Amino acid sequence: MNSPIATVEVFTLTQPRKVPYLGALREGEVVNPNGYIVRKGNRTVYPTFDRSVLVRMTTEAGTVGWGETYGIVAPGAVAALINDLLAGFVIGRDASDPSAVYDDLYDMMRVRGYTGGFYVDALAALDIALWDIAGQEAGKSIRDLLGGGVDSFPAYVSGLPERTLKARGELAKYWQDRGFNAFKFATPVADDGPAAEIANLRQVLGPQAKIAADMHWNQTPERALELIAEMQPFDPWFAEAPVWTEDIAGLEKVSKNTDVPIAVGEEWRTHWDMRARIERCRIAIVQPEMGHKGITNFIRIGALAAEHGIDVIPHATVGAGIFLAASLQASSTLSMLKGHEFQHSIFEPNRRLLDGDMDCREGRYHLPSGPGLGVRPSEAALGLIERI
Amino acid sequence: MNSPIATVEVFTLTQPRKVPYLGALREGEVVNPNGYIVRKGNRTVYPTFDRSVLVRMTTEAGTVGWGETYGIVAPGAVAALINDLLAGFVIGRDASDPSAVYDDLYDMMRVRGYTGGFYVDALAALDIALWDIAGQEAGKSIRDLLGGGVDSFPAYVSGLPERTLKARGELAKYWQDRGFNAFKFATPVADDGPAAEIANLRQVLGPQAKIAADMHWNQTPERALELIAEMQPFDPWFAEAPVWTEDIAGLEKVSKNTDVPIAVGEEWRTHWDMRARIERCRIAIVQPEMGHKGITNFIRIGALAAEHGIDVIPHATVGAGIFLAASLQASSTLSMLKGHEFQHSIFEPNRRLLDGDMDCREGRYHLPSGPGLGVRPSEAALGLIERI
Numbered sequence: 001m002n003s004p005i006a007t008v009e010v011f012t013l014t015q016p017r018k019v020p021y022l023g024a025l026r027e028g029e030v031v032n033p034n035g036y037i038v039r040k041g042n043r044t045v046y047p048t049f050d051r052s053v054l055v056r057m058t059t060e061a062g063t064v065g066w067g068e069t070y071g072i073v074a075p076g077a078v079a080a081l082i083n084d085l086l087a088g089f090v091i092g093r094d095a096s097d098p099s100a101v102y103d104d105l106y107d108m109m110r111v112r113g114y115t116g117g118f119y120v121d122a123l124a125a126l127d128i129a130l131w132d133i134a135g136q137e138a139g140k141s142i143r144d145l146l147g148g149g150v151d152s153f154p155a156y157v158s159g160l161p162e163r164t165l166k167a168r169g170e171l172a173k174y175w176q177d178r179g180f181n182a183f184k185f186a187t188p189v190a191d192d193g194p195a196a197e198i199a200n201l202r203q204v205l206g207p208q209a210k211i212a213a214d215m216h217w218n219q220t221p222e223r224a225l226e227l228i229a230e231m232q233p234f235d236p237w238f239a240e241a242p243v244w245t246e247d248i249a250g251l252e253k254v255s256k257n258t259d260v261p262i263a264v265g266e267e268w269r270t271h272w273d274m275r276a277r278i279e280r281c282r283i284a285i286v287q288p289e290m291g292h293k294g295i296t297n298f299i300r301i302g303a304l305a306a307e308h309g310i311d312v313i314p315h316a317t318v319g320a321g322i323f324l325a326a327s328l329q330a331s332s333t334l335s336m337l338k339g340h341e342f343q344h345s346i347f348e349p350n351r352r353l354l355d356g357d358m359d360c361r362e363g364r365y366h367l368p369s370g371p372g373l374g375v376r377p378s379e380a381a382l383g384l385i386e387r388i
Numbered sequence: 389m390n391s392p393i394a395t396v397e398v399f400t401l402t403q404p405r406k407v408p409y410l411g412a413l414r415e416g417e418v419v420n421p422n423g424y425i426v427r428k429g430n431r432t433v434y435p436t437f438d439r440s441v442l443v444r445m446t447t448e449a450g451t452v453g454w455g456e457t458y459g460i461v462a463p464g465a466v467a468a469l470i471n472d473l474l475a476g477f478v479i480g481r482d483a484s485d486p487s488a489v490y491d492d493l494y495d496m497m498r499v500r501g502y503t504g505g506f507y508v509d510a511l512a513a514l515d516i517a518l519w520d521i522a523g524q525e526a527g528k529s530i531r532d533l534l535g536g537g538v539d540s541f542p543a544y545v546s547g548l549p550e551r552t553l554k555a556r557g558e559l560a561k562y563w564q565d566r567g568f569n570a571f572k573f574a575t576p577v578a579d580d581g582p583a584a585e586i587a588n589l590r591q592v593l594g595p596q597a598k599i600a601a602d603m604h605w606n607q608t609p610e611r612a613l614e615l616i617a618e619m620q621p622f623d624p625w626f627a628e629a630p631v632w633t634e635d636i637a638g639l640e641k642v643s644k645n646t647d648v649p650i651a652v653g654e655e656w657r658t659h660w661d662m663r664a665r666i667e668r669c670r671i672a673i674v675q676p677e678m679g680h681k682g683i684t685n686f687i688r689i690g691a692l693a694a695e696h697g698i699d700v701i702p703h704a705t706v707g708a709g710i711f712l713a714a715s716l717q718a719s720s721t722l723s724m725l726k727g728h729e730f731q732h733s734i735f736e737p738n739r740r741l742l743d744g745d746m747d748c749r750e751g752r753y754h755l756p757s758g759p760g761l762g763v764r765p766s767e768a769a770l771g772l773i774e775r776i
C-alpha cells in the first residue's frame with residue numbers, strides 16, 4: 001500500500017524575474033557576487049532572479065512526489081542538508097504517516113538549535129513530497145487525506161508593481177474589476193507614506209474593499225503605532241509585520257495599543273514560533289508560508305489558531321507552484337481560514353511550469369483535483385531544473 | 389590601519405580522534421549509510437567523525453584571521469551560505485568595527501526568519517575571523533580590544549564519559565584530585581536514574597564539590613520538576629535544559645517552581661533568544677556556545693546577563709581550538725563569568741591542531757598570549773583541512 005522511499009533528488013529552478021523590482025533600489029545599490037543586492041532602506045538582501053528548490057521523491061514502486069521550498073538565497077544550504085543528512089533518513093521510510101517522518105527529522109537537530117531557518121525549509125520540501133506520495137498511494141487529494149477540505153476560497157491581491165501612486169491605484173482598480181475585493185500594499189513602495197497610499201487606495205476602491213498594510217518590519221513599536229494611527233481613518237483591514245520578528249515585546253506593545261487587527265507569521269517555521277507570540281501578544285491573523293513550513297507544520301499552526309480564535313490568511317511568494325499547491329491543500333482543511341494571498345504576477349507566468357488544474361480567478365483560488373498534491377512540474381519545467 | 393578583506397576561504401577539518409558518546413551504543417541503534425547515527429533516547433543525530441568548519445580570512449595587506457563553527461552535520465550548509473552569499477558582503481569591508489559587519493550580515497536575512505540555526509553558525513565563523521584580524525591589526529589580543537580580560541579562570545568537567553555509575557564517580561574523583569571543583573553529569577545515562585547518580589557523585593566527591601545535572605531537554609515541565617525534586621537533597625549546583633528549547637512556557641513553569649538554579653542556552657544564537665526566555669522565566673545561568681554564536685553575539689549575551697544578575701557559564705564542544713580560543717577571549721571580559729565547560733576529549737585535539745599557548749591545567753583555563761585570538765592552525769591542521 002505505502003511503498004518505501006527509494007530516492008530523493010534535489011533541484012533548483014532559476015528564471016529571470018518578470019516584474020519590475022529594481023525600482024525599490026533608490027540609493028545607488030550595487031550587485032554583489034552571485035547576483036545579490038541589499039536594499040539600503042531595510043538592509044534586506046534580494047536576488048536578481050527567481051529561484052526555488054524542488055525535491056523529487058520516488059517510491060520503490062515508482063510513485064513520484066514533489067516538494068518545494070525557498071531557494072532565492074544560497075539554495076546549496078537546503079541541498080546540502082538534504083543530500084548529506086536528511087535523504088538518508090527518509091529513504092526506506094514510507095508515506096503511511098508523513099507527520100511521523102517530519103517529527104523524526106525535526107528531532108535529529110532540535111537540541112542544537114536548528115529549529116527553524118534552512119533546516120525547516122529543508123523539512124518543508126520533504127514533508128510536501130511525502131504527503132504528495134501519501135495522497136497518490138491512497139488515491140486521495142492531500143486535503144481529503146487530511147479529513148476533507150473545501151475546493152475554493154477567497155484570494156486577496158498582493159503586489160502593485162507600478163512606479164507612481166496613481167498607477168498603483170489604477171492597477172488595484174483593474175484587479176477590483178476582475179472580481180477581487182481584498183488588497184494589500186507594501187509601505188516602503190509608498191513615496192508620500194503609507195497614509196497617502198491607503199488614502200488613495202480607499203478613494204479609488206471604495207469603502208467596501210478590504211485594504212491591508214504590510215508594514216514590512218522596519219519600525220520601532222512606537223513608530224509602528226504612529227503609522228497605524230495615520231492609516232486608521234481609512235479603515236485598514238489589518239496591519240501586517242509592524243515590528244522586527246525578534247521583538248516579541250515590541251509586537252506585544254503594538255498589538256495592545258491599537259484596535260487595528262495585527263497580522264504576523266510568514267517568517268515563522270513551526271507552531272512553537274506561534275506559541276511564543278500568542279502567549280504574549282494580541283494576534284488577529286496568522287499568515288503561514290507553506291514554503292518555509294511544510295504541510296505538517298501548517299496543519300498544526302492552523303489547529304492552534306482554531307484553539308484561540310485566530311484567523312488564518314496564508315502568505316504567498318516566488319516559487320514554481322508546488323509549495324503553493326501544498327498551501328492550498330492544507331489551507332482548505334482549516335476552520336479558521338478566511339482566504340489566501342494571491343501574487344498575480346508570479347502565479348500567472350508559472351501556469352506553464354505546472355501540470356494540474358490550480359487556478360485563481362474572480363477573487364477565489366480553485367484547488368487542483370488530482371490525488372496527492374494535484375500538481376507537478378510540467379515537461380517545460382523539467383527541461384529547466386538543474387541538479388544541486 | 390585596517391586593511392579591507394581580500395579573500396574568504398572555507399574548509400572542513402575532520403579529526404583523527406573521536407569524542408565518546410555520552411550513552412553507550414544500544415541494541416537497535418543503526419549506523420546510517422550517510423555516516424550518521426540517531427540515538428534511541430532523544431532521537432538526536434550524532435556523527436561518526438568529529439568535524440568542524442574553518443574560515444581563513446585574509447586582508448589585502450595579508451593579515452590572516454581564522455574563524456570556526458560547527459561542522460559535525462552537513463557542513464555544506466554553512467559552506468554554501470559563506471561561498472554563495474556572505475563572503476561577497478564581507479570582501480571589501482574591514483575589521484575596524486567587526487560587530488558592524490556582523491550586524492549588516494545578520495540584517496540581510498532576519499525578516500525571512502533566518503535568525504539562528506546554520507545562518508548564525510556561518511556568521512559566527514566570519515565574526516571570529518574578523519575579530520582575529522582586528523586584534524592582529526591593533527597589536528592587541530581580542531580581550532584587550534574588548535576593554536580587558538582576566539588571563540585565567542576556573543574550568544569545570546562538563547561530562548563523565550564512562551559506561552558505569554561507579555566508573556563515572558571514579559572519573560569525577562580523578563578530576564577533583566587534579567584541581568577541578570565542579571562537575572556535570574547527563575541525567576538520562578544512569579540505569580538507576582539521575583537521583584541515584586547525583587547521590588553517588590555527592591558521596592564520592594564530598595559536600596564541597598559542585599555537581600550539576602544536565603537534563604537533556606526531553607521532559608514535560610511536570611516530569612522535570614519531579615526529577616529536580618528527587619535530586620534536590622543532594623545539593624545540585626544547577627539543573628540544565630529541563631524541558632525542550634522551544635517550550636518557553638514549560639521553562640517558565642519549571643524555573644518558577646524550584647529553587648534549584650536553572651541553566652540554559654548552549655543552543656541559542658543571539659541575545660534575542662535570551663530576551664525571549666528571561667522576560668518570562670527565572671534563569672540563573674546562561675551557557676553560550678561560541679561556535680554557534682561568534683564574539684559579537686557572545687559579548688551581547690554577557691552584557692544582557694550583567695544587566696539582570698545572571699551568571700555566565702559557557703559551553704564547550706569539540707573543534708580545532710579556534711572557537712574555543714574565541715570563547716576564552718570573550719569570556720575573560722565578562723563580569724558575570726562563573727566558569728567555563730571543559731572536557732579532556734574536547735580540549736586535547738587543539739594541542740596538535742593549534743599553535744599558541746592556550747591551556748587548561750589544574751582545573752583552570754589559561755588564555756593564550758599575543759594579538760587577535762593568540763592562536764592559529766598548526767602545520768598538522770593546515771595539512772588536514774579540505775576546501776568546501
Ligand code: NA
Pocket residue numbers: 240266287315
Ligand atoms: Na505576510
Ligand code: NA
Pocket residue numbers: 628654675702703704729
Ligand atoms: Na552547557
